Structure 1
């Protein structure tokens, strides 16, 4: 999470450190999302901040509509490739890393999400959950 967020994530395995580039699963016109910082993130000497499913990240768009580039913006993680472990006992993992552009309240800039979305993310951000395709 970070805030603007409804509910609470149980901890899930991190896979998207600073510098990770993930796919942009929305119709915003952005193709990349370059993670420059993670919202929750604590501090530890030389730990890269790393996001996981359904966290809010600060990101920049490396590829897409010119208007959408050379600036930082919140994004929300809807898919991660790093396998994580649900309390129901299953280690699952999506096939790529996707994120959706969002404002600080959590409201997507887009209106549609290509790809499936992990439920943990959907439960965190209703507005994400709205425009979502298949969830989990």
Structure 2
């Protein structure tokens, strides 16, 4: 939804991020980013508000493991410049599990959620307790 404004691409492939939603699992590891065409050697990099494919880890729920799922990162540690010039850096790396049509698997998103994710994905905005 909308046109994304460029942020800082905080997370490259191989990053393990925590899971904000309950139905997801503690570790969500990036595998690929959506709409990624890059020059040689560039590790596909994602950022808050992009759709990234994640794999539930060994620590995660047995039922959801061993599969590749879509996700949008909610909390990105790296500083990014919103147009108003504020640079906001979240405390820890984390993400939510969303179907490509916007369906969050979990009942609620827990932890402060980025403004950028809310605009791009509508359901996240309704279920985010403390938008920052």
**TM-score of the two chains, using structure 1 as the length reference:** 0.93
Distance in 1 (CA, whole Å) between partners of 2:24 and 2:55 is: 13
Is 2:78 aligned against 1:78?
no
Which residue in the other structure is 2:42 paired with?
Answer: 47
Aligned residue runs from structure 1 range 10-89, under 5 A: 10-62=5-57, 63-89=59-85
Is 2:75 aligned against 1:107?
no
Give the alignment partner of residue 92 of structure 2, picking from 69, 90, 96.
96
Structure 1 SS opposite 2:89: strand
Which residue in the other structure is 1:3 paired with?
Answer: none
Residues 24 and 105, structure 2, Cα contact 8 Å, conserved in 1: no
Distance in 2 (CA, whole Å) between partners of 1:128 and 1:29 is: 14
**TM-score of the two chains, using structure 2 as the length reference:** 0.95
What is the number of residues matched between the two proteins? 131
Q: Deviation at 1:29?
A: 4.2
Distance in 1 (CA, whole Å) between partners of 2:77 and 2:35 is: 20
**Which 4+ residue blocks in structure 1 deviate beyond 2 angstroms?**
none
Q: Deviation at 1:40?
A: 2.3
Which residues of structure 2 form unaligned runs of 5+? none
CA RMSD of aligned residues (A): 0.9
Distance in 2 (CA, whole Å) between partners of 1:37 and 1:49 is: 6
Which residue in the other structure is 1:131 paired with?
Answer: 127
Which residues of structure 1 form unaligned runs of 5+? 1-5
Structure 2 SS opposite 1:47: coil
Structure 1 SS opposite 2:53: strand
